[PDB]
């Protein structure tokens, strides 16, 4: 990846913190500049060699002076979680399914590359023009998105990502509701262990909910891989 000198960046507006700015690179390209080390930089290098239409891209990294930063392409509509919330009531069900399909295409690519996301959730996906969804923050090596084998034993895998993808589906079809709202981490773990699952969102069809539930099977071996999920989702986009 290209290294970027901080003099090449113009910071126009802070858009996020707890530090992201809209800015320009070379007074030309709009960029999202994320301000903070070896870990942060390593994620950038991993992502700069993973090229898929549904995965966010980087222009480069800025190593000039601390705080260091990453320079990403600017996704015009922000994170998926906020976007679902601010546009509540304006989505057709097909648009919502299309969003899940976008994410799943990206995850199927990561799965094939043996890359485990570990923190898949609507807040880690971004929305571009024409409501295209890209997966973000996928270069790393919250109990509400965690599978049981993750919250009890730290056993991360693509199938644990599949569990998180079911929860993300629930966030999309519920248009940005918070899962297990007001329930404590302790409460979530207990509810899940006794077989509880998130309720069917009203914009979700019976078939969509079945797929959510296949993603939340107790045993990771019982969950479908993303490459299979992708086709299941696509099948339903015609009839279901």
Ligand X SMILES: C=CC(=O)N1CC[C@H](Nc2nc(CN3CCOCC3)cc(Nc3nc4cccnc4s3)n2)C1
| Look-up of token digits 């922000």 | 78
85/67 Cα distance (integer angstroms): 32
C-beta of residue 209 within 8 angstroms of C-beta of residue 200: yes
Q: Mask: binding to ligand X, 125-154, rule CB under 6 A, as x and -?
A: -x---------x------------------
Q: Which is nearer to ligand X, 129 or 238 (CB)?
A: 129
From the list 13-21, 100-108, 187-195, 211-219, the region that binds ligand X by CB under 6 A is 13-21
Based on the shown chain and the rule CB under 6 A, indicate whether residue 53 belongs to the binding site for ligand X.
Answer: no
Instruction: Tell me: does residue 56 bind ligand X (CB under 6 A).
Output: yes
Strand partners, 224: none
For the residues of 25-41, what is the DSSP string, one character each? Answer: ETTTEEEEEEE--HHHH
**64 vs 82, which CB is nearer to ligand X?**
82
Structure tokens at 123: 């807040």
Q: How far is the CB of 2 from ligand X (least distance, A)?
A: 16
Whether 119 is catalytic: yes
Residue with tokens 């207990």: 190
Q: Determine which residue in the list 59, 74, 170, 226 makes contact with ligand X, applying CB under 6 A.
A: 74
C-beta of residue 226 within 8 angstroms of C-beta of residue 215: no
**3-class DSSP state for residue 133?**
strand
3-state secondary structure of 62: strand
**Residues pairing with 10 in the sheet:** 24
Cross-strand bridge partners of residue 208? none
Q: Is the peptide bond before 229 cis (omega within 30 degrees of 0)?
A: no
**184-213 footprint of ligand X as x/- string (CB under 6 A):** ------------------------------
Instruction: Specify the stretch interacting with ligand X by CB under 6 A; choose among 43-51, 73-81, 103-111, 153-161.
Output: 73-81
Using rule CB under 6 A, residue 168 touches ligand X:
no
Q: Is 10 helix (H, G, I), strand (E, B) or coil?
A: strand
Supply the minimum distance, in Å, between the C-beta of residue 192 and ligand X. 24
Compute the least distance from the CB of residue 177 to ligand X, in Å.
15
**Which of 25, 209 has the CB closer to ligand X?**
25
Determine if 4 is a binding residue for ligand X (CB under 6 A).
Answer: no
Q: How many alpha carbons lie under 13 Å from residue 85 in its C-beta half-sphere?
A: 10
The annotated binding site for ATP is made up of: 15-20, 34
Residue 110 vs residues 59, 100, 115: alpha-carbon distances, Å: 20, 15, 5
Of the listed 29, 39, 82, 119, which one is catalytic? Answer: 119
Query: Which residue lies nearer to ligand X by CB, 61 or 192?
Result: 61
Determine, following the binding rule CB under 6 A, whether residue 78 of this chain makes contact with ligand X.
yes
Q: Which residues are catalytic?
A: 119
Footprint on this chain of ligand X (rule: CB under 6 A): 15-16, 20, 32, 34, 56, 72, 74-75, 77-79, 82, 123, 126, 136
């Amino acid at each position: 990846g290209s290294v970027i000198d901080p003099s090449e960046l113009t910071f126009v507006q802070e858009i996020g913190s707890g530090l992201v700015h809209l800015g320009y690179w070379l007074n030309k390209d709009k960029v999202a500049i994320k301000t903070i080390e070896e870990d942060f930089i390593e994620e950038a290098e991993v992502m700069m060699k993973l090229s898929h239409p549904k995965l966010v891209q980087l222009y480069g990294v800025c190593l000039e002076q601390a705080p260091i930063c990453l320079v990403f392409e600017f996704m015009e509509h922000g994170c998926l979680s906020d976007y679902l919330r601010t546009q509540r009531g304006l989505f057709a069900a097909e648009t919502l399914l299309g969003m899940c399909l976008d994410v799943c295409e990206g995850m199927a690519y990561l799965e094939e590359a043996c890359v485990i996301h570990r923190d898949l959730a609507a807040r880690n996906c971004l929305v571009g023009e024409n409501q295209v969804i890209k997966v973000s923050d996928f270069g790393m090596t919250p109990v509400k998105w965690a599978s049981p084998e993750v919250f009890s034993f730290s056993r991360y895998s693509s199938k644990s990502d599949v569990w998180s993808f079911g929860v993300l589906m629930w966030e999309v079809f519920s248009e940005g509701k918070i899962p297990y709202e007001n329930r404590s981490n302790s409460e979530v773990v207990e509810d899940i262990s006794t077989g509880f699952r998130l309720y069917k969102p009203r914009l979700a069809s019976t078939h969509v909910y079945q797929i959510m539930n296949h993603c939340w099977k107790e045993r990771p071996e019982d969950r479908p891989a993303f490459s299979r999920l992708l086709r299941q989702l696509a099948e339903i986009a015609e009839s279901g």
